[PDB]
Amino acid sequence: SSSRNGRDSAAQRLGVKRFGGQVVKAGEILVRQRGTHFHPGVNVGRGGDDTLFALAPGAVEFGAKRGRKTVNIVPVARP
Amino acid sequence: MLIPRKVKHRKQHHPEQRGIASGGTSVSFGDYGIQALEHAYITNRQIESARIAINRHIKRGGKVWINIFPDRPLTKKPAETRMGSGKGSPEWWVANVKPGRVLFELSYPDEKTARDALTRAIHKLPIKARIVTREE
Amino acid sequence: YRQLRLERVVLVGVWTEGSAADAEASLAELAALAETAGSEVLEGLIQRRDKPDPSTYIGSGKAAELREVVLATGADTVICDGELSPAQLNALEKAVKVKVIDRTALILDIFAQHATSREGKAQVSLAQMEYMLPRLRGWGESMSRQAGGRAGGAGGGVGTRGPGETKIETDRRRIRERMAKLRREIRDMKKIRDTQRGSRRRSEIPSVAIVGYTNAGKSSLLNALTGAGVLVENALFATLEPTTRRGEFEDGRPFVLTDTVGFVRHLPTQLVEAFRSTLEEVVDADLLIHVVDGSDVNPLAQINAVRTVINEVVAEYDIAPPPELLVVNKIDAATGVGLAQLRRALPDAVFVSARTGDGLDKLRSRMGELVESTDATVDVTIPYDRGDLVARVHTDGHVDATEHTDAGTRIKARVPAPLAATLREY
Amino acid sequence: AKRGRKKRDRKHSKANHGKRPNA
RNA sequence: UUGCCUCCUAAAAUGUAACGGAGGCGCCCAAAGGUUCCCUCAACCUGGACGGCAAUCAGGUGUUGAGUGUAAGUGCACAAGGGAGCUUGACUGCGAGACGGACAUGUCGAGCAGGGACGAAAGUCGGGACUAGUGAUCCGGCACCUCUGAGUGGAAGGGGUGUCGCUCAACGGAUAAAAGGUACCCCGGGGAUAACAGGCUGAUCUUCCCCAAGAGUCCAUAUCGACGGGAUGGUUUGGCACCUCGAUGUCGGCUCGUCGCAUCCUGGGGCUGGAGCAGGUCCCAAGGGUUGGGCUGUUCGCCCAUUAAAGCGGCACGCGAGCUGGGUUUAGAACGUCGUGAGACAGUUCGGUCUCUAUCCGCCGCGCGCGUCAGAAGCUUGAGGAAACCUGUCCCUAGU
RNA sequence: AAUUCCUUGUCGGGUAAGUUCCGACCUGCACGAAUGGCGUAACGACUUCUCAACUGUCUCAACCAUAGACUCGGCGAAAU
RNA sequence: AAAACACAGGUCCGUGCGAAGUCGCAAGACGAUGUAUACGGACUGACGCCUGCCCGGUGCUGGAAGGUUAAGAGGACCCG
RNA sequence: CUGUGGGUAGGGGUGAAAGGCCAAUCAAACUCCGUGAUAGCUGGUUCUCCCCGAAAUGCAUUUAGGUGCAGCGUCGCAUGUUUCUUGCCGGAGGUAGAGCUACUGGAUGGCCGAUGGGCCCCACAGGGUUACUGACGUCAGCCAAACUCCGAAUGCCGGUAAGUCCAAGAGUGCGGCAGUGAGACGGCGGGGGAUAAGCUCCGUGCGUCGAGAGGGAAACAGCCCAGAUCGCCGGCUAAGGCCCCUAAGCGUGUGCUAAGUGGAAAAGGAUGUGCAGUCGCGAAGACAACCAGGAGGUUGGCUUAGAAGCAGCCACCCUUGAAAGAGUGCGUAAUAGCUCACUGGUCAAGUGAUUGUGCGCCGAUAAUGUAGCGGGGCUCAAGCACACCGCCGAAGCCGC
RNA sequence: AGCGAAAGCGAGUCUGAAUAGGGCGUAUCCACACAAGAGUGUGUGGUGUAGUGGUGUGUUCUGGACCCGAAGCGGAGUGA
RNA sequence: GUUACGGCGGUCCAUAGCGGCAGGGAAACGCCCGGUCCCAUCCCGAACCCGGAAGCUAAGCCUGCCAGCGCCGAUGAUACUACCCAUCCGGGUGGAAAAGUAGGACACCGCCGAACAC
Ligand SMILES: CC[C@H]1OC(=O)[C@H](C)[C@@H](O[C@H]2C[C@@](C)(OC)[C@@H](O)[C@H](C)O2)[C@H](C)[C@@H](O[C@@H]2O[C@H](C)C[C@H](N(C)C)[C@H]2O)[C@](C)(O)C[C@@H](C)C(=O)[C@H](C)[C@@H](O)[C@]1(C)O
Ligand SMILES: Nc1nc2c(ncn2[C@@H]2O[C@H](COP(=O)(O)OP(=O)(O)CP(=O)(O)O)[C@@H](O)[C@H]2O)c(=O)[nH]1
């Protein structure tokens, strides 16, 4: 016989790249996703391909605003 | 006989034969029931055989419920073939039975005849099963 | 069990010998076999050719003509009678690219569908082997479909290996030994019969066997006569094993009645092993009964069809024209009037009509008075004071009242041979 | 199948603890 | 089948194979992009004209159930879905800090001149809801450039910037340019990889069983037993590819065997649907026996004439350093078929080298040596083995 | 059929018993007219069947002699 | 060792004669000291009855008017 | 046919064509040279010891038994704890599980039974017995890798505190040199297969072998214990053992086991344990013996070959409760013969059925030879549980 | 002495109309300030940057390239 | 500082929602009367936008009470599971659901500005 299957795209290596509590520079990619599983939060921007990145530096913080998981950057005061 | 009118996926992984049944583990329709005690793929062939056994024993009268439904397809690659060249096409339909699942149920006046019919079904079945009752 | 998908269908009459009417009969017969396999007839065409085409069977032009209606119908059931050689099946499959039916495989797989007993299905599997072994290495879905019979030059020069025998001969030896074992497997039902073979037969239980064309009503007659519950359905081959039951007469001697598997015409001849169950019943029977339904197809062609095989088997077997009784029963509610011509062609009309009419007294007579016989006309005169002298006569044999108006008179009864030979003892 | 059956079942021993190479 | 995208496999990060289960893609966009501002979709009536299941715009009702340009998902009702106004953010030119990242491809673009509107102020945009819709380098095209210009002036040519040309789709792309046969074959390798045999599995096969609906004349279990279920054996076809390709000779017959019992002839049993004579069936039993021919190489199988019967299997489908070569499987040739041919056939046919002085074990016989507590000799017991074991007709008993 | 898978095609001959052989039918998977079609006397270490005779081919093997084998003396290898 | 090759016989094709064909770069040679009733090539294969249809594909043999069609001194124009 | 002398020579000769012959070689002779051809292939590669020590994976590949780079080794430098373990804390997830009336898909019954078919009044007016499809669905209880209202455990990312820290001989970076890129089995999670394979393909800060000796599994790379620096004729132990082979223990206590179970399996049956219930039993006589009981309309009708108690056919629902059922069992033409139940006394302790509750049982099966404890042997356990004591046991640990 | 593709400029240079930022360079390190906490920069001041020839060793390049081994290919000759 | 106040916001955005029973407009919020004007309908002054307070708390909004639908939801137990013991069976330690049950809940908090008070 012959199977009509056998194909698959290259895994795109999505998911969270910085988890809550990780301190990030201004511009780091916090999440990679195809929709908005996470929505951009404070000082977090959403890119063309729905990549969540840090608009400002500081620690990643996962929260929820109006029933939508959100990625926030909380500033880290310099000690 | 018992065949799904349509399955979303014709070729499925073998249902996992692990754990005790979480649902359908008690008589809920009839007076008596056949409870499984071992894991098995109860094929529709076996279900038909057991159901006919019960109905013919209990003769005229009584009611028989078949709780399980053989909705899981199991494939069989064509005879005398080498490993590979894709998955075989569905060949037989089974119901993933796990221990403690009540496969059949019976409501019949005579307890003697009911137990005999259920025992005959258990004989047609491919695993250990016991005649459980509703009365706990 | 080697089934096939039919649902919709269109028929064609090959008609390579005989009359258009006979070709239509054969077409409708195979369409009924198709229904038995499960289908729904739509319409049937006819053609008129000489010896089948050695390669295409139906020819290139008719193959394309039928491919046209095939592609119009969009199903795979187009029916055409006949026995197709492996080459003919190859050519037809290449032409049509779909599944066309042949009489032999249709009969064989309907036997598979209807089989319920171990012996029956073993016989049908033997027929499968007989039919398929020729369809090996050559036919459509063959073993050597450019994929089989690979093991060729395994010995260029020589070395440390080699299977030996010819590949095709070994591959055939597989099925040859399979069917050799299956033919060895032949079970003697004579051991089941012996309860009445030597005993009874000789002990007077005569043997009436109902044989006839399929759908005719053989099992229905068995049930009506013997109060049985035998399977009754319009489908072809409703009866699989030749069952039997009891049925008595005014002259007692329970006539062990036996039904059979019906005939149609030009049977495959490979499932003669399957039919041995009924062939043996005919050969060992002392009264054959043909059953003909009231409004049955054709005036008389099914009778010739059955009688062909009857004559062949019985003449090969023994010196016998076993009593045949072509009774015309089950005629009420036949919903037809053109039956006087058949009645004059053969005088009989004894309606049981699936018990609706129940006028089988004439039958119950014929069955019986044809070939019934014992040591009738024995005058067992006895004082009637001993009690022993009346023993066993009214129990084993069967009295007929006769002069026995009282006990002190001439007492006679039709008794078995063993019971009384000189036991009158005046 | 006696040979394989024995070779396999001799893993059920106190020393092997129910496991052997090649079953 | 080969590249790309989506899903599940994938074992809740990422990733993860199979000739695993499913599909899509080699596009569409001048609006389906940008931006401003508005709107929500399905499903039923109080009810409707031709009007129906479905049109209407019937909102009259009804809570985010449809729709996303397109596969799949992740998303989107806050809208990313539906409408309009303007417009061309593919900021094109320059580019943040950052990040996704075997080596060869992606996300924000915060800032800059110059824009787009809507507007009104604030405001947002580097084609698209997002991930596919593509092809390195080399070679050359074509435009522009304040670059070089083989003595100088230009020029040719080159360079830069921007772009273009590959179903290079075998999609990391041997060449710009390429199909077959080999049985006439050859060499380098491989038990990394098939054919025989061994091994594992036991689907298939083979022997049985388990319940007993039925068949057996009334009478599941005399004989059988479907629908289903459970295993044995490892003699079939297979699956795997584990030793062997610095060679394990391959069928059939012959010779010689040896073993198992799943017994083709003794024992009783029962049951017998055993009256008798004969049968069937299982139980026990492997002592011995179990053929001669015709057809075919033939294993088998059919047949012939017999017999108590002409048993089934294992032993490398036992046995070619024991034999034969009938077929199979080199080279010659012909036929049929396929091939525009060399050739091929999983078809037919005729013809076609069967090597080896036995070292070791093994086995059949035979010696020599030494033992058996002095050296000899006759006769010996028998631990232990080896051999053999077959059975048929006719008479009476009794025509009981 | 040196050609036919179905195929041991069907029928008749020949045998006691004929997957072989001969003659026909021929529904030629897949004969065919100068890679010639069909016949053909003669010819053939060709292939294939039949019969007579003949016989150790065989039933079923026995015996005899030579050459080895075996023993003795001399010379004296080999593959592995 | 044959059923294969050859064979005598056939048919087709080529060849006007230091022929065609072949060996040679060439000269030359063979063909042949021959002459189309001869040579070479192809196929078939005594002999007998015959070799039926087809020139569509591909070769070969002729050429029907066109169109396509390199190599040149046809050299406008254009460019340094 | 043959002698002698000649001619034709290698991509060539010769060939009544076999790819034949051309100096024992011919599908392109031979010799020399190019030349030490080239071979991703096979083989071989020679002294020692000290330290460390892999890989059999990813990607790509005219690639798949090769190679590049990465991964992993080593040696130098540089950083120095950044590594790793454990606790805590911040995280995202959609697996196991579960649920599905939370979606997308497969299922018991009443409800409307709406859209409908016959009956329907036969009218198309109008309405119901409406066993019928009985829908969307209403309401009651069940499955999915490509279902999710949910949802762990681990794992992973990050932070923090410690631990390890005369070391893991850690992590990272850059260099010199690599080898590896054929993996195997075992446990767990999975795909393909028949949820076979000692099968195949994956995952696994999983292990071991590979590359690992030593002890135990009998023998036995991958299983268990345990990682060999050397020497001891010392000791304690691990796994495993402890009757003799073979070193303690034919250990102690309480039980079970009757088959050699132990020392192979899917099973029908209960007669071994203990259970725990349960009718009647009490020595207010229970299961039992001896135990008069044998024609009530008793051939009861059914019906008739008799249908006698009795082929059969549902019945006989009754009493001085005497102990007898219009009588189920063997019969038997049919009666008859002789009894099942219960009884009437002696009745001289228990008597049956039950989930078998759970232990431990018994029914089973290849071919050289016991043969499925390693052997002898073991049930007077040397078998099996539960306890409890010792030791024997390695290259382990300790001692020197 | 680098940057760039050069007119080239030069501790700068290339890109860019755009002193807009980046690329690559200015050994390295230390102090001072100015700044910004976007991951540190800017200048200023200090010490002054280290190659290159032999040669050992390990890899490597071109050669036979650690050694052995084809079938075969070519040139020229030898053989009827 | 008090309100059956209006807005702007927060909640790991329903414990908040939906539905029901009753209540008020003081300033406000609204409905509401018109389209002359800015502005607007792919038609409509319905909406948007513009002027007024004629009328009304009937609606919207808000207050209290209903646990009816939805929402949350334990604790136990179980499933599952990391590691470990275990010769197939299982078990231990640590974590621990989903469902269901008890129940909770008819929201809570911050800022302004309103009317009155001060
Ligand atoms: C007389 C003298 C020759 O004898 C034979 O001809 C026998 C009769 C051959 O067998 C015959 C065998 C035969 C006849 O059988 C089919 C056929 O194969 C050919 C013709 O040779 C031999 C032994 C062949 O071997 C066999 O080779 C086979 C390929 C496989 C087999 N084994 C490895 C599996 C192996 O032994 C083989 C290769 O010639 C052996 C090689 C060493 C030789 O060439 C040697 C020199 C032989 O010529 C010889 C022994 O001297
Ligand atoms: N109307 C009618 N139908 C009849 C009559 N006889 C037979 N049939 C039909 O035949 C069917 C039964 O066939 P059957 O009696 O088995 O015939 P059969 O001879 O046994 C053929 P088979 O052996 O293959 O079953 C019934 O369905 C019945 O309708 C008749 O007299 N009248």
DSSP of chain B, one letter per residue? ----S--S-SS-PPPP--S--SSS-S--SSSEEEEE-S-EEEEHHHHHHHHHHHHHHS-SS-EEEE-----EEEEEPPSS--S-SSPPEEEEEEEEE-TT-EEEEEE-S-HHHHHHHHHHHHHHSSS-EEEEES--
Residue tagged 């004082």 (tokens): C383
For residue C178, report the phi and psi dihedrals to the nearest 5 degrees. -55, -55
List the domains of chain B with CATH numbers.
Answer: 23-135 (3.90.1170.10)
3-class SS string, C232-278: CCCCCCCCCCCCEECCCCCCCCCCEEECCCCECCCCCCCCHHHHHHH
CB C317 within 8 A of CB C281: no
Round the CA-based radius of gyration of chain A to a whole number and report it.
16
- CA angle in degrees (0–180, nearest 5) for C309-C310-C311: 90
Chains that touch B (3 or more CB pairs under 8 A): A
Q: C116 CB less than 6 Å from ligand 1?
A: no
Sheet holding A15-16, edge to edge: A15-16, A29-32, A52-54, A44-46
Nucleotides on chain J that have an atom closer than 7 A to a protein CB are 11-14, 79-80, 86-88
Ligand nearest C294 Cα, by number? 2
- Tell me which residues from 2 to 31 on chain B have a beta carbon below 7 angstroms from nucleic acid strand H: 2, 4-9, 11-19, 22-24, 28-29
CB A21 within 8 A of CB A57: no
Q: Cβ–Cβ contacts within 10 Å for residue C276, how many?
A: 17
Q: Residue C18 and residue C2: Cα distance in Å, rounded? A: 32
Residue tagged 């001799």 (tokens): D10
Cβ-Cβ pairs closer than 8 A, A with B, add up to 10
Nucleotide nearest to C391 (CA to C1'): H333
- Experimental technique for the deposited model: cryo-EM
Say yes or no for a CB contact (<8 Å) between B85 and A5: no
Taking CA atoms only, the protein residue closest to ligand 1 atom 33 is C159
Q: Give the C-alpha distances (Å, rounded to integers) separating C182 from C123, C185, C222, C272, C401.
A: 8, 5, 31, 14, 55
Interface-testing mutation among A1, A3, A5, A7, with chain B (most B C-beta atoms within 10 A): A1
Residue C224 CA, nucleotide H131 C1', distance (Å):
30
Cβ of C49 near strand F (distance < 7 A): no
CB C128 within 8 A of CB C55: no
- Per DSSP, the three-state class of C45 is strand
Q: Is C278 exposed, middle or buried (0-12, 13-18, 19+ CB in 10 A)?
A: buried
Q: Residue B107 and residue A26: Cα distance in Å, rounded? A: 72
Task: Enumerate the residues of chain B whose CB falls inside 8 A of the CB of residue A5.
Answer: 86
Q: B2, B42, B38: which is closest to B20 by C-alpha?
A: B38
CB A31 within 8 A of CB A38: yes
Chain A 23-52, CB below 8 Å of chain B: which residues? none
Q: Cβ–Cβ contacts within 10 Å for residue C27, how many?
A: 22
Q: Residue C95 and residue B103: Cα distance in Å, rounded? A: 50
Q: Is C9 exposed, middle or buried (0-12, 13-18, 19+ CB in 10 A)?
A: buried
**What is the C155 CA–ligand 1 centroid distance (Å)?**
13
- The secondary element (H helix, E strand) that includes residue C62 is helix C60-73
Residue D8 CA, nucleotide H186 C1', distance (Å):
13
**What is the B7 CA–ligand 2 centroid distance (Å)?**
40
Quick one: CA torsion of C266, C271, C277, C278, rounded to 10 degrees? 0
Taking CA atoms only, the protein residue closest to ligand 2 atom 14 is C217
Q: C229, C198, C227, C248: which is closest to C372 by C-alpha?
A: C248
Q: Residue B25 and residue B136: Cα distance in Å, rounded? A: 13
Residue tagged 């998981």 (tokens): A69
Quick one: CA torsion of C117, C123, C128, C134, rounded to 10 degrees? 180
Pairing of strands A39-40, A69-74: parallel
Q: C156 CB less than 6 Å from ligand 1?
A: no
Round the CA-based radius of gyration of chain B to a whole number and report it.
16
Q: C294, C413, C412, C307: which is closest to C342 by C-alpha?
A: C294
Residue C222 neighbours by CB under 8 Å, 6+ apart: C210, C228, C230, C243, C245, C257, C258, C259
